[PDB]
Amino acid sequence: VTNQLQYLHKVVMKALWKHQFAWPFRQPVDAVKLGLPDYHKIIKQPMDMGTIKRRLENNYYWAASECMQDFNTMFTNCYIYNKPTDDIVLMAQTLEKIFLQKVASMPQEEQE
Amino acid sequence: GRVTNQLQYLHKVVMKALWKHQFAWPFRQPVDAVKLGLPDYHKIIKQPMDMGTIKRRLENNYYWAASECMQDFNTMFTNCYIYNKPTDDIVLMAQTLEKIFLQKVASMPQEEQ
Ligand SMILES: Cn1cc(-c2nc[nH]c2-c2ccc(F)cc2)ccc1=O
Ligand SMILES: Cn1cc(-c2nc[nH]c2-c2ccc(F)cc2)ccc1=O
């Protein structure tokens, strides 16, 4: 536990998890379900909110940067695999905007 | 706009680190679609951004809050991931720079002066 990680839990993940655009990011990408046979060839480190939430709830993370990199990885995976025109990219952009808005107000020192 | 402690940190800590980086050179000026032979660039990327634009903007007091400057950084990176092929070195260069940006943004002063 740190102030910064409780911030990313109680402010960042609270806001994003309940967002009307969050639903595609709440669980891992299912290439079989979604019909994306190339997905795991293109994307090597899958990431999703569900995994990050669990990790925040089990104190998996040692630094706030570590949690922030997972959010980044989740958004980057989306922009890299998906066509520029796809709605999912707009939904990713909107979520990442809130992530960054909130991270700009995150506590400055990681005090344990 | 106005000057705060956060926008000083973004200018004098974050932007300094990224700018000198060995992978930073493709990001220091706008993408020249004509010069680089990328005729579809402006048809795909509708809001171009580069650290050169962000730097001038921090130097001419364009930004009102740190969050506005951080959104410009995000657009710069996101444009790279959206336009380029996944296997392209540029995408690896952006990811690396983006990781350093998020590490440094984490250590930014909490409240905005
Ligand atoms: C992160 N992420 C999620 C999904 C996803 N998750 C649930 N539904 C979808 C989805 C289904 C059909 C469609 F046309 C677009 C998206 C797809 C790609 C991706 O990169
Ligand atoms: C942001 N950004 C920058 C450039 C860029 N800027 C200077 N040189 C290049 C470049 C040239 C040739 C090449 F094979 C790869 C990159 C290209 C794409 C892009 O999205």
Swiss-Prot record, chain B:
Q: What is the effect of changing L102E?
A: Loss of homodimerization
Q: Which residues bind a protein?
A: D40, Y83, N84, K85, D88, D89
Swapping P86D leads to an effect described as: Abolished binding to histone H4 acetylated at 'Lys-12' (H4K12ac)
The UniProt-reported impact of E98A is: Loss of homodimerization
Which part of the chain is the Bromo domain?
A: 2-108
Q: Where in or outside the cell is it found? A: Nucleus; Chromosome
What top-level branch of life does the organism fall under? Eukaryota
Q: List the disulfide bonds.
A: none
Family of the protein in this entry: Belongs to the BET family.
Q: What does this protein do?
A: Chromatin reader protein that specifically recognizes and binds histone H4 acetylated at 'Lys-5' and 'Lys-12' (H4K5ac and H4K12ac, respectively), thereby controlling gene expression and remodeling chromatin structures. Recruits transcription factors and coactivators to target gene sites, and activates RNA polymerase II machinery for transcriptional elongation.
Add the further remark from the entry: Some specific inhibitors of BRD2 that prevent binding to acetylated histone are promising therapeutic molecules for the treatment of cancers or inflammatory diseases. ABBV-744, a small molecule, has been tested on tumors with success: ABBV-744 antiproliferative activity is mainly restricted to cell lines of acute myeloid leukaemia and prostate cancer and is able to displace BRD4 from chromatin. GSK046 (iBET-BD2), which specifically inhibits the second bromo domain, is a promising therapeutic small molecule for the treatment of inflammatory and autoimmune diseases.
Q: How does it assemble?
A: Homodimer. Interacts with E2F1. Interacts with (acetylated) STAT3; promoting STAT3 recruitment to chromatin. Interacts with CTCF; promoting BRD2 recruitment to chromatin.
Q: Any domain commentary?
A: The first bromo domain specifically recognizes histone H4 acetylated at 'Lys-12' (H4K12ac). It also specifically binds histone H4 acetyl-methylated at 'Lys-5' and 'Lys-12' (H4K5acme and H4K12acme, respectively). The second bromo domain recognizes and binds histone H4 acetylated at 'Lys-5' and 'Lys-12' (H4K5ac and H4K12ac, respectively).
- What's this protein's name? Bromodomain-containing protein 2
